[PDB]
């Protein structure tokens, strides 16, 4: 019959998603591996 009938909803689907994170993404890990010589196998180092 005549009238205004509600059928369904419609949402605006989201487009491409993004993620944002801060600056200062660093410590010098090279100073551990770019050491010129390594020590004796009885002097293992924990460069914390």
């Amino acid at each position, epitope marked *: 019959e005549k009238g205004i009938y509600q059928t369904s909803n419609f949402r605006v689907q989201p487009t491409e998603s993004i993620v944002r994170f801060p600056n200062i993404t660093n410590c010098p890990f090279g*100073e*551990v591996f770019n*050491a*010129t*010589r*390594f*020590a*004796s196998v009885y*002097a293992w*180092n924990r*460069k914390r």
Partner: nanobody
Amino acid sequence: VQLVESGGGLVQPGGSLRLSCAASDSSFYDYEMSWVRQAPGKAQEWIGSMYPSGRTYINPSLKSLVTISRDNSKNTLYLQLNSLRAEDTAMYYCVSNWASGSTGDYWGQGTLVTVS
């Protein structure tokens, strides 16, 4: 100045020589103080080592050529050179912590040595 070196000079082939290094305090020698040489052309190598456990074990290749002793009155450290040939040009630095890689060694100025 807290560490110095004394002795050394021209080496007549077949002659004897005296060399030394010093430190500042008794805690500075604690726990390890090991001799070391360097050399232009020839690879750097450690001369002698005195471990803090009382047992001294020099390198199997360098344990039958160098005599090592310590004197804390001057903090001096006797070192002697014997029978250098034309193939052993070495320049001597007194650098600690060589059994810790290149992350614990202390670099200063040292002295320059030429052996003809």
